[PDB]
Design a protein around this ligand. Sequence first.
Ligand SMILES: *[C@@H]1O[C@H](CO)[C@@H](O[C@@H]2O[C@H](CO)[C@@H](O[C@@H]3O[C@H](CO[C@H]4O[C@H](CO[C@H]5O[C@H](CO)[C@@H](O)[C@H](O)[C@@H]5O)[C@@H](O)[C@H](O[C@H]5O[C@H](CO)[C@@H](O)[C@H](O)[C@@H]5O)[C@@H]4O)[C@@H](O)[C@H](O[C@H]4O[C@H](CO)[C@@H](O)[C@H](O)[C@@H]4O[C@H]4O[C@H](CO)[C@@H](O)[C@H](O)[C@@H]4O)[C@@H]3O)[C@H](O)[C@H]2NC(C)=O)[C@H](O)[C@H]1NC(C)=O
Length: 32
Amino acid sequence: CSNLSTCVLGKLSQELHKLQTYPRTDVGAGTP
Ligand SMILES: *[C@@H]1O[C@H](CO)[C@@H](O[C@@H]2O[C@H](CO)[C@@H](O[C@@H]3O[C@H](CO[C@H]4O[C@H](CO[C@H]5O[C@H](CO)[C@@H](O)[C@H](O)[C@@H]5O)[C@@H](O)[C@H](O[C@H]5O[C@H](CO)[C@@H](O)[C@H](O)[C@@H]5O)[C@@H]4O)[C@@H](O)[C@H](O[C@H]4O[C@H](CO)[C@@H](O)[C@H](O)[C@@H]4O[C@H]4O[C@H](CO)[C@@H](O)[C@H](O)[C@@H]4O)[C@@H]3O)[C@H](O)[C@H]2NC(C)=O)[C@H](O)[C@H]1NC(C)=O
């Protein structure tokens, strides 16, 4: 990711989707 802006918000949004939908079933959280 050249962005680290559009991309980082995308990854944070994806992380939030996963942990909300399911408690814990391989949450992404690739957000250093
Ligand atoms: C996360 O990552 C993603 C990755 O995708 C990022 O998305 C991408 O982001 C970039 C950068 O913003 C985008 O680039 C864009 O590039 C165009 C290039 O020009 C196009 O539009 C022209 C419009 O007309 C202008 O030019 C004519 C001719 O000189 C003038 O008469 C007009 O008045 C305008 O100035 C067009 O002319 C170009 O060519 C076409 O038309 C001509 C003329 O008819 C033909 O000859 C050609 O053949 C052809 O048909 C071309 O289509 C920029 O225009 C975009 O916006 C910049 O320029 C605008 C106009 O000046 C200005 O209003 C904007 O503010 C902006 O200006 C900034 O950037 C300029 C370019 O570097 C600088 O010169 C300027 O100083 C200023 O810094 C835009 O830059 C990508 O499209 C976009 N998507 C993809 C898929 O790549 C995303 O942004 C990232 N997000 C974050 C948060 O990090």
